[PDB]
Amino acid sequence: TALVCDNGSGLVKAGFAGDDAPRAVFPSIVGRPRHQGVMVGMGQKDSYVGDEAQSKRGILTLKYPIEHGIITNWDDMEKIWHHTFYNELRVAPEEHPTLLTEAPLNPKANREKMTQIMFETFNVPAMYVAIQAVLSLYASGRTTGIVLDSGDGVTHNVPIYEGYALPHAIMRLDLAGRDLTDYLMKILTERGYSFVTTAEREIVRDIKEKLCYVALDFENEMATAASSSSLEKSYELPDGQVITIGNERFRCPETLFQPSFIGMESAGIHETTYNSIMKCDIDIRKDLYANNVMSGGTTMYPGIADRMQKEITALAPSTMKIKIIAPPERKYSVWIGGSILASLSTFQQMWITKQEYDEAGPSIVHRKCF
Amino acid sequence: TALVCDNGSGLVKAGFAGDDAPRAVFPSIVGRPRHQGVMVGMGQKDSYVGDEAQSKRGILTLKYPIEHGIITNWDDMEKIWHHTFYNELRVAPEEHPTLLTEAPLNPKANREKMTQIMFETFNVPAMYVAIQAVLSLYASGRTTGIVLDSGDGVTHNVPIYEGYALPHAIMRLDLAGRDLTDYLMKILTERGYSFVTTAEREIVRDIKEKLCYVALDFENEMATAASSSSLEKSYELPDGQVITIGNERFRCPETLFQPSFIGMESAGIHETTYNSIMKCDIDIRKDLYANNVMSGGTTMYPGIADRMQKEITALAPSTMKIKIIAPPERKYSVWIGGSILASLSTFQQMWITKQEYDEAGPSIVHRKCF
Amino acid sequence: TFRTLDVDSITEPVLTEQDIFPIRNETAEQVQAAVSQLIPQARSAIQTGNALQGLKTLLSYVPYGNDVQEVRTQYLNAFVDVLSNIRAADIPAFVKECSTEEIDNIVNFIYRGLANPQAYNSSVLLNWHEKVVEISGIGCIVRVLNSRPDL
Amino acid sequence: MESAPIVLDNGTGFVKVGYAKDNFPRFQFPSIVGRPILRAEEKTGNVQIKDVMVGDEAEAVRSLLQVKYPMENGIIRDFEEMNQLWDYTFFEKLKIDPRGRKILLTEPPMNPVANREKMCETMFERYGFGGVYVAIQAVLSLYAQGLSSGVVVDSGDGVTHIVPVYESVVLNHLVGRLDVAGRDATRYLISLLLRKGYAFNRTADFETVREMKEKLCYVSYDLELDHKLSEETTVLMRNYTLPDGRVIKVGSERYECPECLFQPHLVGSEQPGLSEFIFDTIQAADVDIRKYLYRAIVLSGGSSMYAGLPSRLEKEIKQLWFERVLHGDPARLPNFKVKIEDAPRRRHAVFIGGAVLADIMAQNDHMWVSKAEWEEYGVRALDKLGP
Numbered sequence A, B: 001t002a003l004v005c006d007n008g009s010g011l012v013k014a015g016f017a018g019d020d021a022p023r024a025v026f027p028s029i030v031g032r033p034r035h036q037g038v039m040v041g042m043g044q045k046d047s048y049v050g051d052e053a054q055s056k057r058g059i060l061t062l063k064y065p066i067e068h069g070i071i072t073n074w075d076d077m078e079k080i081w082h083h084t085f086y087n088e089l090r091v092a093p094e095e096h097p098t099l100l101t102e103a104p105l106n107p108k109a110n111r112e113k114m115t116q117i118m119f120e121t122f123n124v125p126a127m128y129v130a131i132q133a134v135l136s137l138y139a140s141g142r143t144t145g146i147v148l149d150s151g152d153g154v155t156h157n158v159p160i161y162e163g164y165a166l167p168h169a170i171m172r173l174d175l176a177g178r179d180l181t182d183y184l185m186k187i188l189t190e191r192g193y194s195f196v197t198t199a200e201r202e203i204v205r206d207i208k209e210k211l212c213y214v215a216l217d218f219e220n221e222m223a224t225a226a227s228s229s230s231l232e233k234s235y236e237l238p239d240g241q242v243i244t245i246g247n248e249r250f251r252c253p254e255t256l257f258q259p260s261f262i263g264m265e266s267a268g269i270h271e272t273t274y275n276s277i278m279k280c281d282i283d284i285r286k287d288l289y290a291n292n293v294m295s296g297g298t299t300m301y302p303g304i305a306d307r308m309q310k311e312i313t314a315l316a317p318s319t320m321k322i323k324i325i326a327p328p329e330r331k332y333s334v335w336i337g338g339s340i341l342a343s344l345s346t347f348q349q350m351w352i353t354k355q356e357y358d359e360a361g362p363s364i365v366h367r368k369c370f
Numbered sequence C: 001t002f003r004t005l006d007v008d009s010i011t012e013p014v015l016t017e018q019d020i021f022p023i024r025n026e027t028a029e030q031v032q033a034a035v036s037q038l039i040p041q042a043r044s045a046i047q048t049g050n051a052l053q054g055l056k057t058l059l060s061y062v063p064y065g066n067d068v069q070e071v072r073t074q075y076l077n078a079f080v081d082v083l084s085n086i087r088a089a090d091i092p093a094f095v096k097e098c099s100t101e102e103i104d105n106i107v108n109f110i111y112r113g114l115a116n117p118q119a120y121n122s123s124v125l126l127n128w129h130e131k132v133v134e135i136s137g138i139g140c141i142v143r144v145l146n147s148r149p150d151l
Numbered sequence D: 001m002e003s004a005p006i007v008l009d010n011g012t013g014f015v016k017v018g019y020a021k022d023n024f025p026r027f028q029f030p031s032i033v034g035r036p037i038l039r040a041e042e043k044t045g046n047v048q049i050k051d052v053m054v055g056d057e058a059e060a061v062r063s064l065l066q067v068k069y070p071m072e073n074g075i076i077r078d079f080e081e082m083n084q085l086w087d088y089t090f091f092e093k094l095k096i097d098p099r100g101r102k103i104l105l106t107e108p109p110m111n112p113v114a115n116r117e118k119m120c121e122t123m124f125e126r127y128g129f130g131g132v133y134v135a136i137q138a139v140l141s142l143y144a145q146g147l148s149s150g151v152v153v154d155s156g157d158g159v160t161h162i163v164p165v166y167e168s169v170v171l172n173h174l175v176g177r178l179d180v181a182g183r184d185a186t187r188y189l190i191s192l193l194l195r196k197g198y199a200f201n202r203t204a205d206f207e208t209v210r211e212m213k214e215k216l217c218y219v220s221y222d223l224e225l226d227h228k229l230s231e232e233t234t235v236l237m238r239n240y241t242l243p244d245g246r247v248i249k250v251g252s253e254r255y256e257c258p259e260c261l262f263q264p265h266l267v268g269s270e271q272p273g274l275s276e277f278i279f280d281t282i283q284a285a286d287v288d289i290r291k292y293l294y295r296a297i298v299l300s301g302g303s304s305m306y307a308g309l310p311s312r313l314e315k316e317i318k319q320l321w322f323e324r325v326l327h328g329d330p331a332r333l334p335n336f337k338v339k340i341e342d343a344p345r346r347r348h349a350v351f352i353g354g355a356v357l358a359d360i361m362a363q364n365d366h367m368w369v370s371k372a373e374w375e376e377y378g379v380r381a382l383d384k385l386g387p
């Protein structure tokens, strides 16, 4: 057995290679109490992680040690790895080799300090640090594609063909499920609901997961929402108090297609995908239109796969046949992909072993890994 | 009088014929305000241009209307042309005959549509539109030579022998400072210096102009940077933060000699000299090696002349003498050569003019502008 | 957290006592010579009983500066020794004939003698303090408050 | 009075009102409404209490009134009471017939859209104003400075909010609310004074602790120094005499009260305070403009007036670029030019700026939402007023 641990930029996913879904999956949060007054001796502690942070959140300040796929806070990130191993998976990590996950175009010092602290603290037998989009390709069961990952903190395109990845054609954008939650906390102010605590951000995330959808055509849904309450829905807070939400259900996800809603200069995910395939050579372009694989929880909204198609088919030339591959398990596809990869007979020679870390230090990861 | 400009793929330069340097030089940019909200008592343009756009840039999307040496936005060129005439040189175009430029192997309609707007919108008495390489053989006291040029969006080799073009051996490569800026911007992500905005392309272009050099022995320079900090340098961004740039400073210009760094499966900058020289006639090839002038702003890198010398000398047979000619006025040399040509004592009959354009249309330009 | 990091010390450099008082022109060895010639005149004036002419000559020069503690302390030792060897009924005849400059050198050093009781007898310094202030007025303490800190 | 547009900063704690080109508010008064009450307190024939008492008439007589506030956090909570402020403002402070007049209103940057709609509806349908414009309160304070760039931060009685501006473009993605201002510091002053046993829990006593805060409080420049003066020394202690004639001693509560703008956790908010809020806003702007924001931070609004706030805020941004950009390396700190603009007028900068803006657009009749345009499109007529 090998461990597979997806370093989720908002949602950690951990399990054993060859198992068909994460054995444990929990928020990438470290929470600290925001109150000094305490019932003495009564079981309190100075850091709560994952589901201990969510279930206690009203008295905590919550902070994710990953932002935009980069670990900003290492003294807290090792608490999350300590939790994945000893409290969620309930193993000694020093018995099992660990497959870790990383975004493309990340700071090389992130992957160095990750491979360093994983051997230098948890003493795993061997480890590897795979790119999230090439992992998702294994779960989709194909050798050609243009994986569109969209997590909590990053979204990226990796054009890939018969296993040859195209590293000049990669696109990455720091717009994801966190920024869509920031924009929902912003626009809900227009209803007269004020959310400001890092606890209330998790309420606005749960609203966004339950009620938001991608408009198939935005300025037609805007006109429809102004024309009737037919589009409005209700949500009940962790207070019994009731929220009503309307065109905010699709103005939030629309940010993913119109980054100028959050002032950010970028192409939306349709134009970013098109400009990524148009950066590949013309013999490959004929096939990757038929293989837009989707990955990660921000690709999960109702209506996204159809609207992703109606936008990308306006940019692609009409002679092409253009398809989105969006599995019902797509939330975990990078972890299922890592679970497949770590189980292959042909992979077992290309782990980084503890023996060869000692011969070179952490900078070995740049030759052993993509 | 006569008026000349290299209508450059990133940096326009313009002035009067017989002047020894261009009197106007500015970014080949139209910028547009990026945000919907403006103070209602105060002035904003429809769009900004040149050094005004460059100094305003924090609130603008910046569009280069020329890309890879092709006019992509005629409706925006009509603003930067107007800016050369009425704002920078302060002329009335209806007094002055004009010399424009383009690269060899350009889209045929580019030559036509610039001719069309110069007579139908800028009313000029006459024009000509010369090959940028041919002008850059002038301003060196020369009539035989293989001119090597790299601009912002264009690179090309033109062998000229004793005043005659040699179009079997002429070739153009779509690598220049734009692609080197994209690659520098990309490899700077590897440190964590994320630059993404069209405005941040400009500060990365400034880092490329100031901090970069072409290393003489890349595979050993890379090992030198891995073993010593003595080639790392600091740059200060316009907010006052300081950025440490190391092996990325010579990995960037290396892309000219190894285009495979940007996924371009094509011959290097030195190899395109050999693939043109060794395609020239059987005797004249022996003294192109004595008359190879460098031109265009991308040929300004420190270390490049020594690299260019040693690499073409390794490809060529060592029986015969080799040099490289690298003027200190390199980055203006197309314009310096145009200033000479447009004031030359036989060129005053060479132009296209309204009396022919009014009956031939723009279709005449292909008949005498080569 | 950031609230405690001082920045004023590294972005707004404050005045120094040598900006407020002019720096001493005489070098450290040049005053160390000038004092070491006077202390033997004061020690001699005690040994010949004319201790009051000892004070008049010792008080003709004063060492000052952060570079000279090892000789400011020797000057203070000689001064407190000379004050301990003048008869209390002679004090009013000495003080009324001192200049306001000499008085402001006496009372300046008695406040240095009163700062170190484990090495100096305070009882005779407090007696000189009463007599010098009663005769010459309260402003002679105000000129000590205001005086150079490296005296 | 004047034929030009009227301008009205209907603030959460003070109404300020006047006309275009006024250099200072024509009138200002507490944004309070009161109803008659009897309260085991003094009564006098010296004044007659009408059924609705407001503004100055209430605040001068509030021992006799059930005082209530039509606004909280910059939003109208009760429109039947805001109607009784607006009646007073127009009919017996300004003494105007509003029929066909043009008026400039203000509101903070992230209000509920239902507040601007019902505020404009009221202007068109109680009073019948001929034209209305609504400006974001902090962009008005930038016209007062005669200025076109640099982040402006406004702190009022209800809300503290920030609006970065560069070269006259307003950065709508960076505008922000801190829901802590001059009233939360006043509810906190009541809560600090309750530890000493002084109770101020009548509705009329709230204006007394506003006057007390406004008189005696200051922002500590160095917390371990004011905690030294507070715990080691009597020197902070100050005697305040209430309108009752009672005298109350106030001490650490002088600095420890307005500190909640710099530390909102003292009032139960998890948001970052002024220094960390302005820093996390400037440091979110694009690389080319951050210099021009730190070189011109503009303070505004009455809750920016605490003695020491300009100096504490400047220090606490130098202190915070040093932690979060230089990582504690002193070598570059002298290169960080930050400047706070803290002009004498700044309590009124939203009004003084509104009175400048209402001159700039007085004659451009299409710039205002007209009554004739409101009565055909309804609430959609307000889409004229920007993004």
Ligand SMILES: Nc1ncnc2c1ncn2[C@@H]1O[C@H](COP(=O)(O)OP(=O)(O)OP(=O)(O)O)[C@@H](O)[C@H]1O
Pocket (backbone or CB within 6 Å): D010, D011, D012, D013, D014, D015, D073, D074, D137, D155, D156, D157, D158, D159, D160, D181, D182, D183, D210, D211, D213, D214, D215, D217, D301, D302, D303, D304, D305, D306, D307, D347
């Ligand atoms: N010198 C001062 N010291 C302390 N607080 C002050 C001072 N001057 C004014 N304030 C406070 O400022 C507030 C009133 O300011 P201002 O008029 O700007 O608020 P407002 O505009 O009515 O509120 P808002 O803008 O949130 O709607 C009150 O809380 C008042 O006590």
Ligand SMILES: Nc1ncnc2c1ncn2[C@@H]1O[C@H](COP(=O)(O)OP(=O)(O)O)[C@@H](O)[C@H]1O
Pocket (backbone or CB within 6 Å): A006, A007, A008, A009, A010, A011, A012, A150, A151, A152, A153, A154, A176, A177, A178, A205, A208, A209, A295, A296, A297, A298, A300, A301, A302, A331
């Ligand atoms: N059903 C859903 N519909 C919409 N959004 C979802 C859904 N389920 C989860 N999310 C989004 O999924 C994101 C987490 O995606 P994930 O792929 O696990 O990110 P990461 O791997 O980088 O941590 C959350 O930020 C949330 O916004």
Ligand SMILES: Nc1ncnc2c1ncn2[C@@H]1O[C@H](COP(=O)(O)OP(=O)(O)O)[C@@H](O)[C@H]1O
Pocket (backbone or CB within 6 Å): B006, B007, B008, B009, B010, B011, B012, B150, B151, B152, B153, B154, B176, B177, B178, B205, B208, B209, B210, B296, B297, B298, B299, B300, B301, B302, B331
């Ligand atoms: N010192 C320098 N070192 C390297 N590149 C430089 C230097 N100075 C300018 N450049 C490059 O010059 C290019 C402009 O060259 P130019 O001749 O004006 O291009 P074009 O032929 O398209 O008109 C820019 O892309 C810039 O990157």
Ligand SMILES: [Mg+2]
Pocket (backbone or CB within 6 Å): A007, A008, A009, A010, A150, A151, A152, A296
């Ligand atoms: Mg993810």
Ligand SMILES: [Mg+2]
Pocket (backbone or CB within 6 Å): B006, B007, B008, B009, B132, B151, B152, B296, B334
């Ligand atoms: Mg050029």
Ligand SMILES: [Mg+2]
Pocket (backbone or CB within 6 Å): D011, D012, D137, D155, D156, D157, D301, D350
């Ligand atoms: Mg206000």
